[PDB]
Amino acid sequence: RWNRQDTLESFMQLILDHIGGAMYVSKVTGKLSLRLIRKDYDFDTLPIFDTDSGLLSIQEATNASPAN
Amino acid sequence: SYNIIETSNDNGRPVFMYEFRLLDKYWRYTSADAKVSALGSIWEPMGVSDDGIKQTGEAKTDALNLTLPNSNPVVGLFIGTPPGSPVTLTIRRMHLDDNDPVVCYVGTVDSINQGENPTVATVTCSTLSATMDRN
Amino acid sequence: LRPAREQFNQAIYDALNGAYQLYVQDAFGQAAANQTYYMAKWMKLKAGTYTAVMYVDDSGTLSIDHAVVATAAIGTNPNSGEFTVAADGVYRFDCIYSNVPADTPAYMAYQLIRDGQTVEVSRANDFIADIVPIPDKALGPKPPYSDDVRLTYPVFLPLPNWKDGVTERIEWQTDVMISESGAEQRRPIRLHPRRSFEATFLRWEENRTLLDTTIAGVGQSPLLLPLWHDMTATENNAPAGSVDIFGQFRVKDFNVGDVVMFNRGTTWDYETNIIAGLDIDAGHMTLTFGLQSDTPKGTRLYPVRVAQIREAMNGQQMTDSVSQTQVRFFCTENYDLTPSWSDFPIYTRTGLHIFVLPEDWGSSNEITSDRLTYNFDNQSGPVVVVDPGGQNYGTVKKSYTIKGRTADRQFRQILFALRGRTKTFHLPLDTNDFILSRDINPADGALVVRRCGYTQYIGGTQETKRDIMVELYDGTRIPTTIISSRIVGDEEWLFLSQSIPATSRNDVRRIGYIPVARLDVDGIEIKRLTDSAGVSQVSLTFKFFDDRRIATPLPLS
Amino acid sequence: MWWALAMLVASVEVWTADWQVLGFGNFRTKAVKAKQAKK
Numbered sequence: 146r147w148n149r150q151d152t153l154e155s156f157m158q159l160i161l162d163h164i165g166g167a168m169y170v171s172k173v174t175g176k177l178s179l180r181l182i183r184k185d186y187d188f189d190t191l192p193i194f195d196t197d198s199g200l201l202s203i204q205e206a207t208n209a210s211p212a213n
Numbered sequence: 214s215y216n217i218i219e220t221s222n223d224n225g226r227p228v229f230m231y232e233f234r235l236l237d238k239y240w241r242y243t244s245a246d247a248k249v250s251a252l253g254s255i256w257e258p259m260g261v262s263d264d265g266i267k268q269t270g271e272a273k274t275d276a277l278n279l280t281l282p283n284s285n286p287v288v289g290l291f292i293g294t295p296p297g298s299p300v301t302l303t304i305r306r307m308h309l310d311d312n313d314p315v316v317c318y319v320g321t322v323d324s325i326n327q328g329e330n331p332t333v334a335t336v337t338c339s340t341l342s343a344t345m346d347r348n
Numbered sequence: 349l350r351p352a353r354e355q356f357n358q359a360i361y362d363a364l365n366g367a368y369q370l371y372v373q374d375a376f377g378q379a380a381a382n383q384t385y386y387m388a389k390w391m392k393l394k395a396g397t398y399t400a401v402m403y404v405d406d407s408g409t410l411s412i413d414h415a416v417v418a419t420a421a422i423g424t425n426p427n428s429g430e431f432t433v434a435a436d437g438v439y440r441f442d443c444i445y446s447n448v449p450a451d452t453p454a455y456m457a458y459q460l461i462r463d464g465q466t467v468e469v470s471r472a473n474d475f476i477a478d479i480v481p482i483p484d485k486a487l488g489p490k491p492p493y494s495d496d497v498r499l500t501y502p503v504f505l506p507l508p509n510w511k512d513g514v515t516e517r518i519e520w521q522t523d524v525m526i527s528e529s530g531a532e533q534r535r536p537i538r539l540h541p542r543r544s545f546e547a548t549f550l551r552w553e554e555n556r557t558l559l560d561t562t563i564a565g566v567g568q569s570p571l572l573l574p575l576w577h578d579m580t581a582t583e584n585n586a587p588a589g590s591v592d593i594f595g596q597f598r599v600k601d602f603n604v605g606d607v608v609m610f611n612r613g614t615t616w617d618y619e620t621n622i623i624a625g626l627d628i629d630a631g632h633m634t635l636t637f638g639l640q641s642d643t644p645k646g647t648r649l650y651p652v653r654v655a656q657i658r659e660a661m662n663g664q665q666m667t668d669s670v671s672q673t674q675v676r677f678f679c680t681e682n683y684d685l686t687p688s689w690s691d692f693p694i695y696t697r698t699g700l701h702i703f704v705l706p707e708d709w710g711s712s713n714e715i716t717s718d719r720l721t722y723n724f725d726n727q728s729g730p731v732v733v734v735d736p737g738g739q740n741y742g743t744v745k746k747s748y749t750i751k752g753r754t755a756d757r758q759f760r761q762i763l764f765a766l767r768g769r770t771k772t773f774h775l776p777l778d779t780n781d782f783i784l785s786r787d788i789n790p791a792d793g794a795l796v797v798r799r800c801g802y803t804q805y806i807g808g809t810q811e812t813k814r815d816i817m818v819e820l821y822d823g824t825r826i827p828t829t830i831i832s833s834r835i836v837g838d839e840e841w842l843f844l845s846q847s848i849p850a851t852s853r854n855d856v857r858r859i860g861y862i863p864v865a866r867l868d869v870d871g872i873e874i875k876r877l878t879d880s881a882g883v884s885q886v887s888l889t890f891k892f893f894d895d896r897r898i899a900t901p902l903p904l905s
Numbered sequence: 906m907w908w909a910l911a912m913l914v915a916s917v918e919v920w921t922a923d924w925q926v927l928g929f930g931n932f933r934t935k936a937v938k939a940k941q942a943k944k
Contacts, residue, residue, distance in 0.1 A: 175319020
């Protein structure tokens with residue numbers, strides 16, 4: 146529901162959070178576009194990145210004890 | 214054949230062309246130093262220079278800041294009274310010996326302000342994602 | 349004969365597109381009885397109408413090419429208008445005025461407005477004023493039609509001081525991204541390098557004044573820079589108005605449509621012209637415009653560049669009349685030259701060109717070896733530096749001295765084959781190594797070398813130490829690559845991926861390394877101690893490493 | 906979860922705040938969004 150109407154970007158934020166997706170603009174056309182964050186990958190065709198294939202540096206090398 | 218040259222480690226060519234568009238009133242620019250001609254149009258070498266096509270999903274930060282020479286009519290459109298109709302900017306990314314300039318940015322000209330660097334003004338160009346503050 | 353004079357009005361001035369008073373007499377109120385006053389200048393004209401109002405004292409007249417076009421009634425009336433020249437070209441604006449017996453003020457002004465468009469309205473300091481009419485050759489050489497805007501820029505006539513050397517820099521922009529492990533990326537940013545020139549100027553006695561006035565006037569604007577470093581001279585004798593010349597332009601910077609300058613001596617009688625085309629072998633050029641006045645045999649020819657002084661100028665002096673200073677310039681046009689790897693070996697096993705350049709033995713070369721990576725430098729205690737890629741790289745700078753104009757072209761073609769930090773190429777650093785203890789036997793397919801610690805201390809697992817050049821004593825270049833080794837006794841065995849002609853151990857000059865190299869600095873400093881015909885030494889720096897990134901382009905672009 | 910990606914800038918999720926009014930206050934059931942006026 147959209148009673149007591151608010152800023153449009155906030156409502157789109159709410160809807161995107163519900164669906165868990167990303168609104169974005171296509172790099173080529175420039176048209177507004179929508180993306181969903183899902184399991185749409187086969188873990189086989191993915192490109193492998195190491196220093197010998199395009200990786201320059203890992204700017205985040207620490208671990209912040211993310212166990213809790 | 215663009216991607217093969219683009220992803221090469223020891224092969225490449227510099228070009229970043231800019232199309233300033235206003236209901237088909239066109240200016241075809243080139244950040245390189247040469248008379249680049251592609252896509253059926255000549256992209257003149259002008260002092261335009263990108264600051265990075267950032268895509269963060271955050272408004273303001275992604276504002277593409279172009280250093281555009283003031284003498285251009287593109288800036289001239291904004292002297293005193295800017296256009297009543299939005300102006301769109303398209304950037305293309307071909308190499309040389311190549312002929313498919315994969316478009317990389319389709320932002321619009323939101324605001325312009327001259328300043329300390331009189332030879333080039335600052336042009337701010339966001340995209341549709343960040344213009345959603347409407348009531 | 350004397351220079352003309354002018355004045356600033358306000359009412360009349362604003363009346364006709366801001367025109368001045370024109371007169372030759374020293375002061376305004378000094379006319380003479382029925383006297384005539386003459387003046388002439390060159391004005392640029394198409395075939396247009398050239399409507400012009402003109403007001404003068406006592407029936408003064410306008411004229412073109414000795415053809416009177418109008419005369420002014422004593423009142424400031426719109427006396428006359430259109431007078432169509434009907435031909436495109438430059439003509440002599442040779443208006444004349446007079447005053448009746450009285451010595452009242454003598455005044456002229458005119459209102460050239462072609463088809464309603466203001467041109468040459470007033471302020472004609474180009475005039476030369478005399479009490480009698482003068483011919484064209486008293487007026488001065490007719491200027492070129494300069495349809496190209498290039499010729500409009502001022503010419504920098506002051507010459508350089510050769511006894512200190514001439515410095516020129518050809519600058520690319522080539523960004524290189526190097527990962528933590530040394531894997532490198534390459535991106536030439538400038539298609540055609542931007543060009544800059546420098547020279548030490550030492551002038552005096554009206555040459556210092558010329559340099560000072562010209563440089564103060566220019567400041568930062570485009571200017572016509574004569575390439576003194578590429579000086580040359582005519583081969584034939586050309587009469588007045590000729591449109592083509594033979595000369596020596598084999599290798600020096602002359603191109604179709606280039607701006608060429610002529611020096612007729614004394615440094616004040618000069619010319620700038622455009623060559624529509626030229627022959628590179630049957631040395632010859634066609635001039636867009638018949639040369640200004642005349643060009644006898646031996647006239648100095650300079651190729652010119654549309655440059656700009658993009659820096660401030662230092663005020664340095666020796667005496668109240670003598671001075672010296674270092675002025676730099678930047679070419680506004682691209683330096684276009686065709687690359688080529690002329691005659692250098694193309695190694696079959698690598699697809700890269702050997703750098704066979706006969707580099708000299710200047711005082712000393714520079715020596716380095718690094719891995720680029722470090723640890724958290726603890727405030728105190730131990731440190732553990734980590735090798736990222738386990739591969740060695742380094743930089744060696746070694747001078748080169750060019751000799752000759754064709755040698756200069758060859759080096760330009762090379763330096764355009766590579767571009768700043770763009771391309772790879774094998775570098776023979778000319779270091780005697782691997783003294784062949786035993787003879788070269790192709791049957792075993794392995795070199796035997798004096799024990800120097802290769803296999804033990806260095807090992808064959810270093811790309812920057814695997815590529816070697818066996819410069820056979822006859823000058824033949826035998827590039828080869830190291831693949832494995834056996835170590836025994838006081839000798840070391842080196843297996844190679846390719847065969848080598850059977851030769852005795854005493855059949856070689858050196859076994860210098862030829863590792864994968866990449867030019868270090870972006871802008872190349874070339875010291876032109878003389879014109880292209882001679883000393884043009886350079887101080888390149890080569891960074892030797894291994895190219896590692898493997899390109900499996902990202903799919904589904 | 907786009908909130909989770911929004912907090913990608915964090916320094917590592919507990920919260921304590923009041924709300925800026927949204928379309929919750931009910932006077933007409935909506936089995937589907939027909940939007941609404943605002944008065």
